[PDB]
Design a protein around this ligand. Structure first.
Ligand SMILES: CCN(CC)S(=O)(=O)c1cc(C(=O)Nc2ccccc2C(=O)O)ccc1Br
Ligand SMILES: CCN(CC)S(=O)(=O)c1cc(C(=O)Nc2ccccc2C(=O)O)ccc1Br
Lengths: 319, 320
């Protein structure tokens, strides 16, 4: 019994809802934002940090699935906006829910973090040493954004979602391709921390607040992510695709390039905008609560993420 | 042929070298004060390199020493809690600088247990049959995260990195592992907080990024929980050497006594490097291979055990 499947899904975002309207009044930018990106509103934290969000997801997953915290063999969080560098968010969550038996760590892979982490989760299970784990992508990008730069401030939201993953009799994780190219890392940065020790003599002026090269990542998505997807499926072999919800125009393009039915690409960024590592799991959980996807349906679903790094990767799983 | 094994090791620390003598003039205290407390004589401190650079060198050296081509690498894991950016990972930055164009890459956050956590992870990856060659580097630039006025913590840490090449093998090398965590104590050991000053945030948080360390809580923690962790894998009979996080030799002394394992088997490293966090074990590992103390493909029973922020701890039992 070596195979793994997703056994439960859960999401949690902050109740504070911020509209393009609100952001524009505040910024001076009207809903060219929506036609530009497919975004209408995101959720923004007013009191929560990232562990607060991931906690909720962890708590909900235990509730809905009816497992004890002590069943969890491990907890991976894919974030790039953790409360601290140390402790990891996962350790904070692991404490908060009393999963005494779990080891936990965070995975740093930007918008690919949830796919990378679900992939690593699958390996931890295939080994036979671990049966049950929680994988959660969570992010509070609002504390990284320079809110007076309308270029990006409008793009990102805060949120969190994840899944419970347990061992199974039959395979579900069918294939995967994980890729990266740090020869283009310049294109999407955040969270630089400046060394001001008495011994440091560099005066590097990297930003602490997020910064992206808009044209580069966009171009990178269409060409590279499209090839990565086609590396796993054609239209005949996939039923749905949950892509990192970073821009609806990317979704459109990737669909035409890949010749995969546009209908099959679920969308979400209208309500949540770009929540990075959280984006796929949020979408996933909505689609399940919508009734679009059903655990055990055997629907053929590919999850594909892409973002800073640069990183990208796809999973083909039968649900 | 799906068993990970360590096929090569290497390490890199900045050139700038800060002796107790120096800190003691700096911090206005004595040579002996520093030494008595830490058990350390000198340690390396960056002056122009970030974690990504220290890891770069490591990867670079593992490539040259193993005579492997970067294009052969399938994955790069970096254990670090002091990255250049949160995004991109140090792992990716390294992956760019060495043209490992075929490898995917990410960071693992698990503080002073990172290397062990990460090594464990590479085993699963290789074990799956999807990947055969990977770099697993622990590197840390913790000097940027200390209040250098405080002789209490700042005299403890040094910078640097070091890691291993892992390759697929016919015969299993990784025998047993136990990874543990206790987030109910995460307050004990913290760094790198980052305050939300968004226009929407109405919370009220102070936030030195500078480390906060509850000394005796984590000292007693290490002596108790680590010991029990080490014993669930081996006893004195079934181990040749143990590579532990180099936090403070007195922890290594007390743990030896609890486990009832020969003290000479616990390799020790800290005089000249100080506490290098995720770096500590893989640097100890490369020195020991220099000495010839450890010999690759000898079948020496070895256990690498880490413990640190989280709280995290964990041990790998592998055959060298
Ligand atoms: C030609 C596209 N341009 C406007 C429609 S844009 O470059 O300004 C732009 C371009 C992107 C983009 O390509 N984003 C990403 C691409 C890959 C991975 C992650 C992202 C992300 O936004 O997180 C998002 C928003 C805008 Br506005
Ligand atoms: C009672 C112990 N005291 C002096 C012997 S101490 O708190 O100053 C101290 C206490 C520790 C310690 O307990 N460190 C750790 C414990 C668990 C995990 C990691 C570490 C680490 O320092 O990396 C290390 C050095 C000193 Br000096």
């Amino acid at each position: 019994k070596n195979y793994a499947r997703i056994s439960c899904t859960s999401r949690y975002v902050p109740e504070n809802c911020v509209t393009n309207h609100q952001l524009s009044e505040m910024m001076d930018t009207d809903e060219w934002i929506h036609s530009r990106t497919g975004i209408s509103e995101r959720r923004i934290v007013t009191q929560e940090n990232t562990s607060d969000l991931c906690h909720q997801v962890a708590k909900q997953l235990l509730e809905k699935s009816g497992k004890q915290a002590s069943e969890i063999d491990f907890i991976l969080v894919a974030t790039v906006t953790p409360d601290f560098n140390m402790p990891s968010v996962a350790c904070q969550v692991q404490g908060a829910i009393g999963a005494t038996e779990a080891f936990a760590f965070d995975i740093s892979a930007a918008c690919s973090g949830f796919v990378y982490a679900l992939s690593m989760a699958e390996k931890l299970v295939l080994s036979g040493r671990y049966q049950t784990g929680l994988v959660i992508g969570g992010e509070t990008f609002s504390k990284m954004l320079d809110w007076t730069d309308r270029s990006t401030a409008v793009l990102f939201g805060d949120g969190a979602a994840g899944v419970l993953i347990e061992a199974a009799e039959t395979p579900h994780f069918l294939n995967e391709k994980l890729q990266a190219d740090g020869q283009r890392w310049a294109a999407l940065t955040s969270g630089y921390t400046i060394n001001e020790s008495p011994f440091y003599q560099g005066h590097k002026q990297a930003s602490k607040t997020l910064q992206m090269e808009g044209r580069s990542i966009f171009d990178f998505a269409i060409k590279d992510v499209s090839q990565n997807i086609l590396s796993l499926v054609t239209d005949e072999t996939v039923d749905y695709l949950l892509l990192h919800q970073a821009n609806v125009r990317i979704i459109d393009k990737i669909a035409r390039k890949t010749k995969i039915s546009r209908e099959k690409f679920l969308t979400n960024m209208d309500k949540y905008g770009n929540t990075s590592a959280a984006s796929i799991p949020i979408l996933l959980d909505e689609a399940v609560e919508n009734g679009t996807l059903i655990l055990g349906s055997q629907q053929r679903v590919v999850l594909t993420g892409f973002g800073g790094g640069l990183t990208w990767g796809s999973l083909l799983l039968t649900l």
